[PDB]
Ligand binder design. Structure first.
Ligand SMILES: NC(=O)c1ccc[n+]([C@@H]2O[C@H](COP(=O)([O-])OP(=O)(O)OC[C@H]3O[C@@H](n4cnc5c(N)ncnc54)[C@H](OP(=O)(O)O)[C@@H]3O)[C@@H](O)[C@H]2O)c1
Ligand SMILES: O=C(O)Cc1nn(Cc2nc3cc(C(F)(F)F)ccc3s2)c(=O)c2ccccc12
Length: 315
């Protein structure tokens, strides 16, 4: 099926469009093309500095009568510098304003780490370290809950949380809403078997980000592994007369994950959606899981001393 049931009763499309590193000069057209070829889920964030332009595209296609708001599933995330209770509603309302929406379908705590409040999204000290804020995960969760109760968002969730951090929330006395989603990096080099098992056993939906290995990530090194260029995956793709990207997108769908590949190239936006017409075999799946190397695209070294850094724990 094309959508997965969340803990709030709403249905979430399992295939969505990613928007990190989509420039404002091209993301409006990306989203318009996306909606035209069938995407209904768009993954956004204030830190991506392009929510206005995403909002332009959504607004235009509503006006064109291509889709209705109820048909769309729009996600954004609360950035690290806004974890203070008194800053959360404002941050959410900035996102809604920019996206020209009156609600979000899902709002995530982007990272478990709070950063020093201010205009700078990555506040560093003079020696390179991120400057933390004195906020904690549960106070931030409480403030996210408030957004549901005010109707600004229909569901809340988390992202880049390890299983101990998820459990902190689950075990919160007087919890109001359980997280609906944990969005994490996931691809054949970082297969996340244990955290996926944990989350699914708790009734939390997992979204896989960077499913193509984020080749456009700004800190890529020539020597890094390259998923789209892996000859082993290319051979699985050839067998199915599909591209490597289609295989990489289909792989998490068959693990009962949501997946959010990013592109601003119209041909690829279309190509990437054409993944509901074939199945990977049991052997394909096994083979792709075997490529795990615990290799993360997303893990800023300047944050490794933060008290809440998520990736010291095994999972
Ligand atoms: N929660 C978080 O912390 C977090 C972190 C990272 C990412 N995410 C979300 O997940 C999304 C996906 O991750 P990502 O942007 O890191 O990377 P990704 O989706 O793994 O890879 C995107 C890269 O692949 C290229 N690409 C797309 N389709 C292709 C195809 N069919 N053939 C060849 N190349 C193709 C894109 O190029 P073009 O765009 O130039 O076509 C871009 O360079 C993000 O955009 C964001 O929405 C969330
Ligand atoms: O955020 C995205 O969606 C993409 C993303 N990822 N990263 C790598 C990061 N690694 C982190 C690690 C922590 C940590 F929790 F681990 F401390 C906290 C925050 C971050 S940002 C970035 O540096 C970044 C910069 C601008 C826009 C998007 C991103």
């Amino acid at each position: 099926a094309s959508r997965i049931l969340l803990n709030n009763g709403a249905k979430m499309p399992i295939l969505g469009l990613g928007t990190w590193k989509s420039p404002p000069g091209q993301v409006t057209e990306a989203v318009k093309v996306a909606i035209d070829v069938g995407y209904r889920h768009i993954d956004c964030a204030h830190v991506y500095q392009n929510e206005n332009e995403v909002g332009v595209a959504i607004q235009e296609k509503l006006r064109e009568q291509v889709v209705k708001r109820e048909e769309l599933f729009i996600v954004s995330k609360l950035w690290c510098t806004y974890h203070e209770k008194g800053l959360v509603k404002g941050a959410c309302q900035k996102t809604l304003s920019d996206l020209k929406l009156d609600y979000l379908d899902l709002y995530l705590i982007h990272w478990p780490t709070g950063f020093k409040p201010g205009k700078e999204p990555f506040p560093l000290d003079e020696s390179g370290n991120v400057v933390p804020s004195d906020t904690n995960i549960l106070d931030t969760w409480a403030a996210m809950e408030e957004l549901v109760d005010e109707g600004l968002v229909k569901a809340i969730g988390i992202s880049n949380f390890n299983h101990l951090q998820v459990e902190m929330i689950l075990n919160k006395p007087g919890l109001k809403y359980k997280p609906a989603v944990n969005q994490i990096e996931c691809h054949p080099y970082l297969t996340q078997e244990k955290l996926i098992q944990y989350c699914q056993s708790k009734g939390i939906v997992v979204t896989a980000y960077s499913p193509l290995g984020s080749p456009d990530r700004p800190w890529a090194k020539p020597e890094d592994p390259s998923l789209l260029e892996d000859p082993r995956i290319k051979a699985i793709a050839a067998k199915h007369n599909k591209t490597t990207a289609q295989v990489l997108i289909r792989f998490p769908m068959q693990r009962n994950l949501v997946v959010i590949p990013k592109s601003v190239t119209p041909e690829r936006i279309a190509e990437n959606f054409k993944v509901f017409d074939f199945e990977l075999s049991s052997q394909d799946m096994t083979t792709l899981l075997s490529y795990n190397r615990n290799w993360r695209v997303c893990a800023l070294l300047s944050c490794t001393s933060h008290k809440d850094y998520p990736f010291h724990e095994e999972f």
